[PDB]
Amino acid sequence: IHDGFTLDDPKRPRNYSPQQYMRSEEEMCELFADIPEALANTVEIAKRCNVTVRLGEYFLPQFPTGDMSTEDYLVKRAKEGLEERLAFLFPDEEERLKRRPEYDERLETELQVINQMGFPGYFLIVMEFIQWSKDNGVPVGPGRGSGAGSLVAYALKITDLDPLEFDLLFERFLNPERVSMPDFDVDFCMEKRDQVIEHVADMYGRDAVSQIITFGT
């Protein structure tokens, strides 16, 4: 099937035998009872081979923050991103004052969990990336995971939905009382991949960037 041929085709290579199954230890011990070294050398080689690959646990990255914390860069851009959105939503300053406390309380409650879980660099990268692709002609996909429940995402123009308007909850998306990963699973339109690959290579390095294979099954 791989080669593209049928079993009984004469042109087909016949390099393989019915003995190529999972023989037991004993079956191999009898097959080679004349060359015991050959069996024993498998055991020996296997004990010399010891690779540690730790799995399921992360490695983080960054953004030009000058001599500032990445944490503190986020705090700054989020307060000030909140200011943009608030003037768009409530362009009357009297209303903005009365409606404001809810947003500030939401903002710092989220900010606490993001920073205490060690997120800030990651969200910064992504928000900048999302903004740049809006400025330029790069379609972003409809998906947001449960990211619409973050008012900070919205404030930062990461998302397009006001979670306070529609009672959307951040804790479905990142839960502080549970090690919850950064599954955030953000998408963009696949047509415009080359433009985005380009920006994120300029940003972080062409060698630090790669596509992910799927599968033919």
Partner: protein, 218 residues
């Protein structure tokens, strides 16, 4: 000694038992010795016990009323049995014909075993499929392939196909033959060093602490 047959019938069942509820109408076979026709053809027509199917009618044409007075399989059971018993049975789509044959045999209730127990049934389609993979290997396909006309011949039904198939069969299985032709002794054993054994111990510790077992240390 080589026995050629092709049986066209009172139509077929598309699903399940192609023979269930159906019966044989004509038996037309040629006998082949040393890849030649002696001319001792056995060509007989038998009792339908039912109506000829519209499909079978369109295949080569045949009236039900013609096969009414003709005898049943019981009247030529021994006759046909001895004619083929202990010989080579070359059939196209053997599952079809053999299925009908053995079906009728069991209906006689004469202790006659299935023909496949005393005769070697060999399918020509299997051979053709091996030789021409993914090609149409029907009778009429091979007919046109070797430029044989089976359409403008007066014989419609068994005797037609039998004759043609014989010629085709011999052609394919002649075709041109080919020539062609087609432990002790000293030896080092690198034993793991003490440093490698330390790495091994540490690596097993990881297996065991993370997994709760290690068969090497059991």
């Amino acid at each position: 000694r080589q026995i050629v047959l092709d049986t066209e019938t009172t139509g077929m069942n598309q699903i399940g038992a192609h023979y269930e509820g159906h019966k044989i109408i004509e038996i037309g076979a040629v006998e082949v010795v040393n890849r030649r026709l002696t001319g001792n053809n056995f060509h007989v027509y038998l009792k339908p016990d039912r109506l000829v199917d519209p499909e079978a009618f369109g295949v080569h044409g045949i009236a039900d009323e013609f096969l009414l007075d003709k005898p049943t399989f019981a009247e030529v059971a021994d006759e046909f049995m001895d004619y083929i018993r202990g010989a080579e049975l070359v059939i196209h789509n053997a599952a079809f014909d053999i299925g009908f044959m053995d079906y009728e045999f069991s209906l006689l209730k004469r202790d006659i075993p299935k023909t496949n127990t005393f005769c070697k049934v060999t399918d020509s389609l299997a051979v053709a499929r091996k030789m021409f993979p993914g090609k149409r290997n029907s009778l009429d396909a091979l007919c046109a392939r070797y430029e044989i006309d089976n359409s403008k011949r007066t014989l419609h039904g068994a005797l037609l196909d039998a004759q043609i198939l014989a010629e085709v069969y011999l052609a394919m299985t002649g075709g041109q033959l080919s020539l062609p032709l087609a432990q002790a002794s000293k030896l080092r054993v690198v034993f793991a060093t003490d440093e490698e054994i330390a790495a091994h111990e540490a690596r097993l510790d990881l297996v065991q602490k993370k997994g709760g077992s290690c068969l090497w240390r059991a």
